[PDB]
């Protein structure tokens, strides 16, 4: 489905490949897309903190934020290549 | 009947998908909307509790209340689906 | 009620927010407010330190301590907003 | 029966070798093969998991998933031994 | 009676303080000074541990066999404790 | 919100532009302004030493001290600048 | 109590205020005092360090040896102070 | 027993002392010595992994194998150590 | 891949021969050709710069920027070789 | 086993003995013989990124991939000690 | 405080303007006033060796010292205005 | 004892008085005493380098080469004086 789809570009592609340090940035400017928290996303691996941001808004707005974020934290020659991505996968179902 | 089509809502929509750790936040923020007990709660399979639900209010109120805890605990994406499935039941009996 | 509102307060204002390692300190100055006990302390659930404190003093001895412990580990900024919370509620039953 | 002796395989040379990071990790890009659950799949015994696969699909299809599975999560060294091991049982019986 | 004293002490002013990982440890060294068991030792709460310590010696040898275990597991200052308060209760029946 | 905009001030104006050498002569002359304390600042990322610093006072207090400190430590050209940025966000809600 | 007065001064006046290097070097000539051991004491966070010292000896002895030991490692002016402020207390309970 | 004073031996002289990161260095080299296994192992508490080792062996070949091991891993201070221990209790019994 | 083998132009040839003093000439005439920064660059290893210019170039633009460069600070010897081994390359994929 | 016998040789006489800067260098030139990834590999212990390495291709490949990087990055003479111990074990098995 | 008002003398009035050349002679003839030592001393930034000489004697001692030694060094100019502000901070708290 | 007075001479009255540099050499001409190794030795904190040292040897010939490093680094003022000092307190279990 397209959202197994999406997960997977998110785990494989994404949090596969991004480091640590730079999560640490991420937290620091996060809570500003998404109501979730403080002191509660500290410690939340990759996975957990994934499945909660889906649990929340969805594979439609936790992506759509996600390429935000990516553009902000200079992040932009994976933020292209996300979008990229992105736009294939919704050829497939234009 | 109604009854028993909302009790498939209840048991196969609803707890046959939900988790555990979130079962005892429940429990914590519970008897808000029953006029059940303590101790009386701890362990209770999911089978028991819905009975004793019933038992008191019925599948007319139990699924309102649940329908608003369902959007306290910010779970909101299981209750924008109970909400939309409950208006498809009303409208086979409007 | 007045006791399912101030345990609002505890649960979502208070614990939804602090952190752990700050709980563990916490932990470590404890005993001196309420009459509980030692590695009878060590693992408990947000939820369940809550319930026995309440099981011994109540909402109001147990809030009053925990404003008091708020003041001490430095906890200031929390501290002000708990107690600006809690007056006002109590202007709601004077 | 080939049963008994595909289960043995499952057990003593599947389950009893792979650790544990890697099944959460599995259970995160399940339910893409079997039509089980969430909540549900959370915390059961590698005994429990294997029987629940075996009461849906079989030993024919939760077998046919696993190898498909061994080898997307990258894991080729244990699915080339599978591979090897199934196609030695299978010559018993062709 | 001297009995329910004794009981008293175990329980109230020893496991109802003493922890867990340390009872592990307990159990390693354990069968040393109790004609018990293996396996049959692993799981049984602190309550069920010392009716079968006394079903067995009594609140004689058991108490006396606590008092030495305490020795030796490093743990003094609970055991000197113990050791006075057994004193003061003989005191009382000399 | 005014909280967030203000972090932005600090994080990328700020800090993603000042030095370390220069941030060791600041611990030296700090405590003077925030009630902190030593051995406890020595390492702190800078995202730490932020947070910490927030955790105490606020973004309104926080920000006029770090002010108040870039002009001592002659530091003046990221000092006017920082002071026209305030002014401009002040404007937004005067 | 008296011990929880003391525990404060250990910790707020005493580890809240100390460095790490110097700890290191603590531990490199420990166990001169104390009846415990080595890679024991590797890793372990101050509030446990100071448990573990206390669980052994007790406010009593191990203030004690902690003034003792802040007058070998050159510590004089932190030792002096610790002395003071001991001295105070003792005046309250002489 | 002969068995009890081996398991003193182990515990108290042998993991009472030695770290962690020795530990994993041990288990990078294990499964040379014993029918053991894999993802097994990885966290397994000195307590549960003895007796893993002697559910399996014995006090007779656990210690001979312990003993081996030590003198591999450059460990020769303890090796030694443990063989003169070894020869002190088996003049007991000779 | 062209990727890796102009990575190892830059590094082997380029940055395994370059010095120092005239690294800090062209950090003080940066910030020219990349949308990098200051402070930001002061320290930071061979392999650090060269990743950060990638991570937001290419090695497509970071090349054609070193080339531009190093015939700006005189450094015409090592920028022709630089031009010929490029070329070379270019050919291959011509 | 051969493998355990290679592993000693990759371990002791390779690990034990290389330094760290030079393992930056090999992680920048990485990814060129095995199919790992990125920002994964920044911070692994020896012990992990052996393990890795092998869990995707073996004591076989990952053997001479080493020998092959080894002399790459100048390393000739740990390069050709380790060919006459391979070569050494080799014969033992011919 | 007087202890802040003294530093900012140290510091700014004095080690700000001072210059290198002479610091090595001041270290040449120092070890006459303090407790500290020598290789210890050799590469020691302003900012840590009057932290040092503070953790050691104080704001008191080490300031008097300080005067007594620019007193010996020749360095009368810098001795005279260091004593003249001296006075002047004492006249506001005598 | 004996062994914490040798390590206190080690440490106070060798370590926390040679300078660097020194070191280099040191090391550069190490391993002809112990069994120790390379790469192995290259940044290891004084108190690691003496700890490892004894941890091999241990306070007899640990210091018994340190004495014979000492007379060949030409450094004999410290040889001298380290000499007298051991003949102090072996004079004190003759």
Redesign the interface.
Same mark, same amino acid.
């Given at each position: 489905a397209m959202e197994?789809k999406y997960?997977?570009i998110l785990?494989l592609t994404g949090l596969?490949?991004?480091?640590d340090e730079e999560l640490?940035?991420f937290k620091?400017?996060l809570s500003?897309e998404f109501n979730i928290?403080? @002191?509660?996303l500290?410690?939340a691996?990759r996975?957990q903190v994934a499945?909660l941001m889906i649990? +929340?808004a @969805?594979a439609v707005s936790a992506v759509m934020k996600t390429i935000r974020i990516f553009q902000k934290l +200079?992040y932009?020659?994976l933020a292209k290549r996300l979008q990229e991505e992105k736009e294939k996968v919704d050829k497939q179902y234009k």
């Open positions: 197994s997960k997977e785990l596969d490949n991004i480091t640490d940035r620091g400017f500003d928290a403080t @002191g509660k500290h410690t691996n996975i499945t649990q +929340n @969805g +200079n932009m020659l």
